[PDB]
Design a binder for this molecule. Structure first.
Ligand code: BTI
Ligand code: BTI
Lengths: 489, 131, 489
């Protein structure tokens, strides 16, 4: 019996129920509500009632841990929401708020249902309020499998992570018809809101998958990292890997020349456990890396610069990416580990015309507000305000480390030499820049002041990180009483 | 009454009625004998310090006027190369279902070529040129 | 005796002490620390010690209410910060955190002090952490009177409001010398970070003043609105104005044609008390108005659309502006009053390439998260998701009102008619669009559903607003327990 799904598969596409079956465990899905009708009675809609009413909501179970989910249905009315569709979603989110369980939704709606009038707006508003209230209480993940237009786009935005499917998905606020009507330009749906556009240009989508099957397979892996609720502790899984594994290849990663580049992944991979990195937003703002990883069987958060791309310089997009990652990680009590290599901020008129001052402050706010244990490692250099922003010791950092060839200075040697000698005799470059770099572009001064705990061999990083992360397991820090902060938007 | 127009003042027999327009906390907009003035009310420190304050001069440009936003011109009011006075409507763009009306802030005349009716071009073009 | 300030005034500029004297009451300033030296002992700095060390910090008193402030000094070392300058500021902020008092700072620093090494970075980090921790506890206002470059720019950014002086002030992260070095373009300091640029292009500065004297005079007026701390109640001042003042001019403000424009200030001004509006960011994103105002002697927050500019259409910049204003207003228990007139969102490729999805969600998050009393008035129209975003009744709104000629529909009549009749006989426009607009583009349906409390004459708005704002004085609402939210950055 394979009835009524032949029409769907013929278009090389899967069904909502099949997606739900693929996500959860083999036999642990219990559909909650299945016999519900729209009761519209307008515009010749009194007929063609549907039992499911276009939504599939249940409970399920992943890796032995509970979950909640819902999936849109494209065959029935195009997946449009109504006064009645939104009730099921509201009930699921409320139940997942009472119990410490997350929510995952597979969006496929074609837009609002016009035949209901303003009831669709009512349902949208209720879903928006539930998302707003419960953000930071239970993790929310959203996946977009098909078209997603109109005002329905906003609820995925408030969710913590949004993923996209490559061939047959798109998302935008207004359709290309209106764009043609007002501006006069003919742009296709994919050219407007395709997965690539949101992966590279707008920065909304947190990832892209080639197929639905791969999407489910990796969504399970992502779910294996998250904590169940706000009050539950960070999960710890058994692992045969051990902190005594030898990592001596880190002694040679940093080149002896100051103008040559290297890949920061060569430093990230040895420290964490084998094959346990899940990069977030891999194709957007490549000069910074963010993602999840495990250290001795417990999930941690990774944020590191990359001198491979644009000399590892902070920017607007990198600031937004890092700020969102830090805020989410702190909201759910996940340790943060950072690797620092920054020469400063990206210089340019477009930057000031685009508001670098606002955006660069977001990362600093996220780092200063955080109360989870932090570990910082300075590999090569840290200059100016970039050193302050990237989790400096003064921002209530727990432990800070440096490598023997690091440099921590106010600015580059040339600018310091220029400002320290206004009209000093010519040729001052040769006998002053070298001396200043020798005397003050070294971690000795910063260690004398007390800004780094110790200068360590690069081969001891795994040992030190495991020791510190084990000791810091029970830190309790609290901020002054506030209704909420006022972050620079 | 606070923040109201009428102000009745009577010294001896003489009686006067003045009006209160507005203020920016250093300058008061008060009306005397049906005429607007701007009196400055400042203390010793403000008086002694207001001498040492730059007084820049605003740009006095008599040149072409551009449309702030894209749209469509549906109605025009003024004629090409004739007199124009301050506060006169010049034309009306319609955009996203809305007719605006950019006027002439201040000038005596113009020298230019009119943008014809229904010219859905805009994009900060030179609709009218003032010379 | 007018010694040592003749050199300053000759350049048409004022001194820090003169600014402090102008701000506070005539004789209520008590300078806190005045005999402090830098103790540097490097690069020939062992000499030329200064008593004040370039900073003036005190307590003062404005309108009989306490304050705290500090001012940079440009004559001494260019206003550079040090390990010692930042200590005074930290002490002031800590004291103003213990006591419920705000802080106001007049920035004039030329950058960091190179002769101290990394101690300047240490001081910057401490100030950044204090700003981050105490944001949302005590209001913070910052004014920029002169140059402000380097990494010192970030602390004004975290503060709630930043104002700028016209002729002789600028702010940016990197100087034009580096821009010329890397990109090769010659841009002046004013062309890069002048007050106009931040007033119109970047949206960082919340206002601009022509002179320092006017800056102080209006800063006092702004201070008269704010509450003293997080736990203190909203100030109420005596006022002869009364709720029984006649406002019948509102019956004629809205034109009888649907395509003609009007000025929303003609609706804003009658409702509030006379000469009591303080616009915030007047020259940026003019399609939305935000500011402070008084209603029956108590300060409230005003957020309204404007059909004068771009048909009152929501956008990126407007969303950011409104979101920041709402967040600040809610953080300190200030009532919010909104006027709604929106046809939707601005359509265009640049918008999606710039991330409309992220930015438009910020206003919705700010409106949904808020717990202060809200009053909403729908004058003419509200369509699509814009109706949901602008404080709809479903987002825990207290009271909502509409005017007799309003319209609340899913979308415009043309699109609804197109979607409701695919290939219906030609000429369907004339006998369908008119009928649909007549039947469903009216507040009767939304009133039937229960989305507006009542349909009122436009002459009763002041009466209704005063009644509701008086009754709602003691509302107590609380959100679920969270360490903090996760707003879409
Ligand atoms: O020496 C002239 C150009 C030096 C630029 C050095 C890098 S480029 C971006 C960033 N901004 C700076 O001021 N320094 C770094
Ligand atoms: O009828 C064709 C153009 C209608 C646009 C109506 C305004 S323009 C911006 C906003 N987006 C919409 O879909 N409608 C409004």
């Amino acid at each position: 019996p394979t009835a009524a799904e032949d029409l769907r598969h013929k278009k090389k596409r899967l069904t909502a129920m099949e997606r739900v079956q693929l996500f959860c465990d083999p036999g642990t899905f219990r559909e909650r509500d299945a016999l519900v009708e729209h009761e519209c009675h307008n515009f010749g809609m009194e007929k063609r009632k549907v039992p499911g009413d276009g939504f599939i909501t249940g409970t399920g179970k992943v890796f032995g841990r509970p979950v909640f989910l819902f999936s849109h249905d494209f065959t029935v009315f195009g997946g449009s929401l109504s006064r009645t569709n939104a009730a099921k979603v509201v009930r699921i989110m409320e139940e997942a708020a009472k119990i410490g369980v997350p929510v995952i939704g597979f969006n496929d709606s074609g837009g609002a249902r016009i035949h209901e009038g303003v009831d669709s707006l009512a349902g949208y508003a209720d879903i928006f309020l539930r998302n707003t209230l419960f953000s930071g209480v239970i993790p929310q993940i959203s996946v977009i499998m098909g078209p997603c237009a109109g005002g329905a786009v906003y609820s995925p935005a408030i969710t913590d992570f949004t993923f996209m499917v490559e061939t047959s998905s798109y998302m935008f606020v207004t359709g290309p018809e209106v764009v043609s009507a007002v501006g006069g330009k003919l742009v296709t749906k994919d050219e407007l809101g395709g997965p690539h556009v949101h992966a590279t240009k707008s920065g909304v989508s947190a990832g892209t998958f080639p197929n639905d099957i791969v999407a489910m397979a990796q969504l399970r892996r992502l779910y294996s990292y998250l904590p169940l609720s706000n009050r539950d502790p960070v999960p710890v899984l058994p692992t045969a890997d051990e902190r005594y594994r030898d990592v001596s290849s880190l002694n040679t990663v940093v080149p002896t020349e100051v103008k040559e580049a290297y890949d920061m992944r060569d430093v990230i991979y040895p420290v964490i456990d084998h094959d346990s990195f899940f990069e977030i937003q891999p194709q957007f703002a490549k000069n910074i890396i963010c993602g999840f990883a495990r250290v001795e069987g417990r999930s941690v958060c990774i944020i590191a610069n990359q001198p491979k791309v644009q000399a590892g310089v902070l920017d607007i997009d990198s600031s937004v990416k890092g700020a969102r990652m830090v805020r989410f990680a702190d909201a759910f009590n996940i340790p943060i580990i950072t690797f620092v290599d920054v020469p400063g901020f990206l210089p340019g008129v477009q930057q000031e015309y685009g508001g670098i001052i606002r955006h660069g402050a977001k990362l600093l706010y996220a780092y200063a507000e955080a109360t989870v244990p932090k570990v910082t490692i300075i590999t090569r250099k840290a200059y100016g305000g970039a050193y302050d922003v990237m989790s400096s010791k003064h921002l209530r950092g727990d432990s800070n480390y440096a490598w023997p060839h690091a440099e921590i200075a106010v600015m580059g040697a040339a600018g310091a030499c220029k400002l320290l000698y206004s009209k000093e005799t010519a040729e001052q470059q040769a006998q002053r820049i070298a001396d200043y770099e020798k005397t003050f572009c070294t971690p000795l001064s910063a260690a004398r002041k007390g800004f780094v705990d110790a200068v360590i061999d690069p081969s001891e990083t795994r040992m030190r990180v495991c020791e510190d992360l084990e000791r810091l397991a029970r830190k309790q820090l609290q901020n002054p009483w506030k209704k909420h902060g006022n972050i620079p938007l | 009454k606070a923040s109201y127009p009428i102000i009745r003042v009577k010294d001896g027999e003489a009686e006067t009625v003045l009006q209160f327009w507005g203020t920016n906390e250093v300058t008061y907009g008060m009306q005397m004998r049906g005429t607007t003035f701007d009196v400055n009310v400042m203390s010793d420190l403000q008086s002694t310090l207001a001498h040492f304050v730059p007084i820049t001069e605003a740009t006095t440009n008599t040149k072409q006027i551009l449309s702030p936003m894209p749209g469509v011109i549906v109605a025009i009011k003024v004629q090409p190369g004739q007199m124009v006075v301050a506060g006169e409507e010049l034309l009306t763009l319609e955009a996203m279902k809305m007719r605006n009306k950019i006027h002439a802030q201040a000038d005596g005349k113009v020298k230019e070529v009119k943008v014809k009716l229904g010219a859905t071009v805009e994009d900060n073009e030179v609709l009218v040129e003032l010379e």
